[PDB]
Amino acid sequence: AHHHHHHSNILGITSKKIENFSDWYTQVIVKSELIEYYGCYILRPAAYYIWECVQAFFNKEIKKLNVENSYFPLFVTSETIMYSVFPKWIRSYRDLPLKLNQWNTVREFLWQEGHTAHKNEEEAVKLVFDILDLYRRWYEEYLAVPIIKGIKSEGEKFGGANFTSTAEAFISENGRAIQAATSHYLGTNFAKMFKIEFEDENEVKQYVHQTSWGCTTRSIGIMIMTHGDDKGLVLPPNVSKYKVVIVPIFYKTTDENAIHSYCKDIEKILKNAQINCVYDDRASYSPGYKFNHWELRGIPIRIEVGPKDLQNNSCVIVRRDNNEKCNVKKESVLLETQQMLVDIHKNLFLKAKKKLDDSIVQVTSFSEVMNALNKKKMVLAPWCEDIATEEEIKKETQRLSSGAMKPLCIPLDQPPMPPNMKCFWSGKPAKRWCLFGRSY
Ligand SMILES: Cn1nc(C(F)(F)F)c(-c2ccc(F)cc2)c1NC(=O)Nc1ccc(F)cc1
Ligand SMILES: [Cl-]
Numbered sequence: 001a002h003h004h005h006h007h008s009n010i011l012g013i014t015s016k017k018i019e020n021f022s023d024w025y026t027q028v029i030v031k032s033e034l035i036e037y038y039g040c041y042i043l044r045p046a047a048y049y050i051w052e053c054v055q056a057f058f059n060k061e062i063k064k065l066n067v068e069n070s071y072f073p074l075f076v077t078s079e080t081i082m083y084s085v086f087p088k089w090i091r092s093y094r095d096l097p098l099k100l101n102q103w104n105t106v107r108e109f110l111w112q113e114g115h116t117a118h119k120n121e122e123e124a125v126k127l128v129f130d131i132l133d134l135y136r137r138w139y140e141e142y143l144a145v146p147i148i149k150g151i152k153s154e155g156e157k158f159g160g161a162n163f164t165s166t167a168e169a170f171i172s173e174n175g176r177a178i179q180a181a182t183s184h185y186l187g188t189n190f191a192k193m194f195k196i197e198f199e200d201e202n203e204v205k206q207y208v209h210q211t212s213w214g215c216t217t218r219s220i221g222i223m224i225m226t227h228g229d230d231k232g233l234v235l236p237p238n239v240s241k242y243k244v245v246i247v248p249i250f251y252k253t254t255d256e257n258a259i260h261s262y263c264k265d266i267e268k269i270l271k272n273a274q275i276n277c278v279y280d281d282r283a284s285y286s287p288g289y290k291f292n293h294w295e296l297r298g299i300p301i302r303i304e305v306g307p308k309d310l311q312n313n314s315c316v317i318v319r320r321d322n323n324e325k326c327n328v329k330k331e332s333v334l335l336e337t338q339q340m341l342v343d344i345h346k347n348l349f350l351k352a353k354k355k356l357d358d359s360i361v362q363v364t365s366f367s368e369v370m371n372a373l374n375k376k377k378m379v380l381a382p383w384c385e386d387i388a389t390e391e392e393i394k395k396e397t398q399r400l401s402s403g404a405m406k407p408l409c410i411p412l413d414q415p416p417m418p419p420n421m422k423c424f425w426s427g428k429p430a431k432r433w434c435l436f437g438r439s440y
C-alpha cells in the first residue's frame, strides 16, 4: 500500500492564470471536480451545489414578488413558446399581473427565465428593475462578484424589447466584459402580435405590458474566473458545501488517538452549529498532500491539528483566499470560524470590486481608446448614442487590433456630462457616458 507524500505537479494547476488564462480555466473547473467533460460536460455535485444555492435564493425572492414557477416544454430556435398562449389566460385586469418563472435545462446547460404581463407600463418597468437588483444580489451576496447595472445600446438590446437592462461583469485577466444577467421591458410588442389584451378597470380594452429576464450558469463561470487563483478553485463560503476541512498532523502512532479524537471534537463543534465540514483522516496521504488537495477544491478554511496544538489546546486556521494563518484556542474555534467565513466573502468581494473599478478608464477621445483596450481595460466614454456608430466603432477597433469593442451598457450611475462634451467617436454632442469593451 502506497503512501503519497507529495501532490504531483500534474495533478495541480499547471498553467498560471495570468500567463495562460484559457488553459488555466479549463484545468481549474475539471481538477476542482466542478465538471467532467464527456464538447458537452457534466455538472458534478460541487458545480450543481452552487446552482442550487443561487436557485434557492432567487426562488425565495421572486416568490415575494408573487412570481410563480411553471414549466413550458416547447422551444423554438432559442426561445420558449409561451406568449401565443397568454390570450387564453388573460381577459380582464383581474387576471393581471401574470408572473411566471421557469428553471430550464438544455455551453451552459441550466438557466432561469421569467416572464410577466402587467396592466400598465410603470408596473412592468418597476418589476424589470426589481429583478435586476435581485441579479445584483445573486452575484454579490452569493458569488462575491461585483456587477455594473446599465441599459443596452439600441444596437445591442433584444429586438423585441423596448429596452434591455443588464448586469455587466468584467474578467480583468483577459480584458473581456461579459453580460451577467438581463432584464427586459418588452412594452406592448408581443401583445400586439398575439392580441394579448384585457378589459381595464374603466371597461376600456388595453394591451398588456410585458417583461422577461434571465440568468444562466454563466454566473458560476464568472465567479470562478473572478476568484480562482494559481492553486485552483476559490469558493465564496455561501456556495461551498464544506466550509472547513480538518487535517490531522502526526507521524508517530503514539499521537494518533489523541490527534484523531481532537479533530473529531472540532468536527462535532462545527457540525453541531450547522457548519458542514470534512475531516480528512486518510492514512495514505500526507498532510501536505491534503493541503493541496483541498485548496484545489476551493474549501474556504482549513483547520490543522498537530501535536503542538494538543499541547497548546489550540489549532491552526488557514484561509483559502489569502493563505493567512492564525492560532486559535479550541473553545474559540466556532466563533472565529463563523467570523472568518464572513470575512472571506467580504474580502473576495472587495478585492474583486477594486479590480472592476481599476478596469475602467474614463476617456473623452477615441485616441485614448486603443491604449486602454491593450491594457485589458474597458472605456467609459461620452457618446452620441447614434445606432449607426456602433458598427463603425466595432469595425475600426477590430481593424486597429474578437478584437472589436462594442457598447456594453449605458450605466445607470452616470457621471456628470460637461456642457459642451462631444461624442468620442462622432464629434457630435455627447448624450450620456457609455461603457465600451472587448467582450465574450
Ligand atoms: C464551459 N465554459 N467554457 C467557457 C470559456 F471557455 F468560454 F471560458 C465558459 C465560460 C465561463 C465564463 C464566462 F464568463 C464565459 C465563458 C464556460 N462556461 C462554464 O464553465 N460554466 C460553468 C462553470 C462552472 C459550473 F459549475 C457550471 C457552469
Ligand atoms: Cl409563442
Ligand SMILES: [Mg+2]
Binding pocket: 072, 080, 102, 104, 113
Ligand atoms: Mg421557459
